[PDB]
Amino acid sequence: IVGGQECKDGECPWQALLINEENEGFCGGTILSEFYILTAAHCLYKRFKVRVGDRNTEQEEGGEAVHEVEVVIKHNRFTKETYDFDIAVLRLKTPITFRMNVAPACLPERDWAESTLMTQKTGIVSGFGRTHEKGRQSTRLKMLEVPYVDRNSCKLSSSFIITQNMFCAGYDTKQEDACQGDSGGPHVTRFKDTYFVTGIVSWGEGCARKGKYGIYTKVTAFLKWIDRSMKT
């Protein structure tokens, strides 16, 4: 996350971190229930685990928990060149025990989310990713309010195709954006003090560059798919 601020105690409880064999985070995820994590398909390229309840990777809090993955469920239509269908669901071997800093985000219904959540002024993105395009990853969990961006404007600004499975958020010139390592993480939208999953951190031409926005997987197009994945 470039800019924004730290997630304070209890503020980003649905954040998950995918960790490699060296205990280093390489991507984010969103807690959907005690058994399931939502992430980006592109993040799945070999052996990894999922950490939850962490806000500071350099200190033992007492809320942290590592979980092993039982099944990786990647969208079969995912394409590496365009990043279309950039979505995956993970089933964990053991259930997550909810507590301070560990809770799920709500899945919304499609029509309501598209007319009411996605028409709000802003969404919130979060992660342990780089704090500037060519810096190191953050040891602190960060969050950032990102405005929804008009779809036509986004298509005009982009050098690469924006499919029906993607949407744009962020700023034209201001120095705030998601970045490397944030991929697969949560984009949530607040409504009457309840936070609903609206996106998955996917890609961008650098981080916070002028005339460029953040591209996110459009969760509302995948709600039936997510529901199927969470039953089998």
Partner: protein
Amino acid sequence: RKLCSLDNGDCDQFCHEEQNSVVCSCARGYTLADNGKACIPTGPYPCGKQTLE
């Protein structure tokens, strides 16, 4: 602005229009209150809520 377009039809969460009438509903883990508008958590750590303890 009518029904669900007018302040979310007074619903806490999901608003649906059926036969010129507002129908409210809630995310999994919440139950619709007696007034048919508010959403009440069924158990501890409901979805979408920042944690306080």
